[PDB]
């Protein structure tokens, strides 16, 4: 059916990436920086999702919010109007979820209509450029699909090094 979720849905390198996280974490601002880097904004703040298959989910923006971004201080901006067609997209299947947790010293999955969508959690902490990390998260996700898993390859190389160091 159709449920609405809180977050920002952007098309990054062809992958639908849903950015979640407590209000105030700066989801919209990060999304703004992503469209400038050449990505597509699907929906800001309210993402209306519905299950297409038993393996895929689709998100979109309620018509009233289409093309809009609310940025604390500036107000509402229309990215279609400020950046053109290359900045928006009617909808997209959701491939990855990156949840922005607020950092404090003290695989993964999330279900959306009984379909487990992969998720990663990045910490919001001074000095971090969130747009860049999310962009790479998508980039890396895509690479793993193409068969290049840096982690799995490293762990393989590490075990050979350990097994070897046993002299």
């Amino acid at each position: 059916e159709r449920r609405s979720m809180h977050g920002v849905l952007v098309d990054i390198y062809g992958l639908g990436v849903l950015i979640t996280g407590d209000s105030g974490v700066g989801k919209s601002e990060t999304a703004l920086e992503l469209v400038q880097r050449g990505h597509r904004l699907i929906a800001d703040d309210r993402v209306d999702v519905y299950q297409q298959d038993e393996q895929t989910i689709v998100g979109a923006a309620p018509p009233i919010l289409s093309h809009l971004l609310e940025i604390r201080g500036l107000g509402i901006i229309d990215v279609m109007n400020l950046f053109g067609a290359g900045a928006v997209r009617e909808d997209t299947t959701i491939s990855l979820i990156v949840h922005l947790e607020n950092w404090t010293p003290d695989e993964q999955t999330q279900l959306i209509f009984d379909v487990p969508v992969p998720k990663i959690t990045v910490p919001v902490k001074v000095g971090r450029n969130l747009a860049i990390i999310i962009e790479v998260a998508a980039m890396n996700f895509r690479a793993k699909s193409m068969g290049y898993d840096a982690t799995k390859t490293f762990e393989k190389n590490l075990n050979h090094l350990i097994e070897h160091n046993e002299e």
Partner: protein, 86 residues
Amino acid sequence: QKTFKVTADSGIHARPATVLVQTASKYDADVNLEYNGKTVNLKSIMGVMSLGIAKGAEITISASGADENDALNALEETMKSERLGE
């Protein structure tokens, strides 16, 4: 949880949605607003306005967390204060 009957002749638009989230935001707890099955985060204004709540609407404000109640009270206080509903 606590429900309301919207009375504002203009519905919950620009200004009203503004004071509502402004009040909800003041609480460490989580707060939601529902209208005809749809549920948004009451702490984010885009979502609230996207619902397009009109006069005569029946909305349900819910919260979760320690703040739970204080959150509700202030939201009720604001619904009334702002003459939005009851």
